[PDB]
């Protein structure tokens, strides 16, 4: 996250790190003790059997006893279009069931179809780069953002740090967008580069898939 702050340790227990050979490459969201919800393109080109879902971490670079690690067993898509970045949502079933505690909890998703109008206050998070050309995050980053509708299409949830150059960066794909206590968006793509200050960042609209998500996790 570019232009954010260090997050209170485990202030977001539903926050998930996806790692390939010990290296973070996408975020995810814990939606059920054996299902994480992430971006569809994070897993579209990767060796799924090498991905390791890491729950309840905070400082990715140091040893944390609160961590729990799982493999991916099954994948659930809902019509992802890599040409137009549409339906950028995926649900990964884990090789086990996480133990819910203070550091690991299940997130709350909105009602099906509930759309956020312009101006709503949200919170983007993730271990993405701290700055374009600056490097990956070691501590979870959070950032107050505002929902926008201009320069956006109905197929996405768009946010914009207003008046500054700040926003999501690379490695923030799959990380949740929390508004009013609900995961309303999975981070998908930026325009022009990280923290352009001109073009809103784009999230997959979770609230449009609640029905499809419920049928998966049951």
């Amino acid at each position: 996250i570019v232009g954010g702050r260090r997050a209170r340790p485990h202030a977001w227990p539903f926050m998930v790190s996806l790692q390939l050979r010990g290296g973070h490459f996408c975020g995810a969201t814990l939606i059920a003790p054996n299902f994480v919800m992430s971006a569809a393109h994070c897993v579209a080109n990767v060796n799924v059997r090498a991905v390791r879902v890491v729950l309840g971490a905070h400082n990715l670079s140091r040893r944390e006893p609160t961590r729990q690690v799982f493999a991916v067993q099954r994948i659930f898509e809902n019509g992802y279009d890599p040409v137009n970045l549409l339906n950028d949502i995926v649900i990964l079933q884990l090789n086990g069931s996480a133990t819910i505690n203070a550091n690991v909890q299940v997130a709350q998703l909105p009602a099906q179809g509930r759309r956020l109008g312009n101006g709503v206050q949200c919170l983007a998070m993730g271990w993405g780069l701290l700055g374009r050309n600056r490097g990956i995050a070691s501590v979870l980053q959070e950032l107050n953002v505002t929902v926008v509708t201009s320069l956006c299409r109905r197929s996405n949830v768009c946010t914009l740090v207003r008046g500054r150059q700040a926003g999501v960066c690379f490695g923030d794909s799959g990380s949740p967008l929390v508004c009013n206590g609900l995961i309303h968006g999975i981070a998908s793509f930026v325009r022009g580069g990280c923290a352009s200050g001109l073009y809103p960042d784009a999230f997959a609209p979770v609230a449009q898939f609640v029905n499809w998500i419920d049928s998966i996790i049951q």
Binding site: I136, S173, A187, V190
Partner: protein, 99 residues
Amino acid sequence: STIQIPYTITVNGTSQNILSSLTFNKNQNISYKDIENKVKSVLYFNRGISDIDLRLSKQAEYTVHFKNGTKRVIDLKSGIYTADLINTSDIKAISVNVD
């Protein structure tokens, strides 16, 4: 410490018969913007394709081929980047096509 990922550039319907490869670090996650600046690089060094030629091209795209058999087709005239990282050691080759 570093690896060589081979690439091929075909502009206007012709591709040079050269064996050309870029330089990436061994086992490192990078973004699709890192890759774009290296594609726009060899696009100029090999066949004189500048930023103005891309903007005025009929279409301009490149394709990351991964070693597992899957690929990802990137639109060079789109300016859009999925906020993900990909590991350099998983990339099989890159192909570039411009008109």
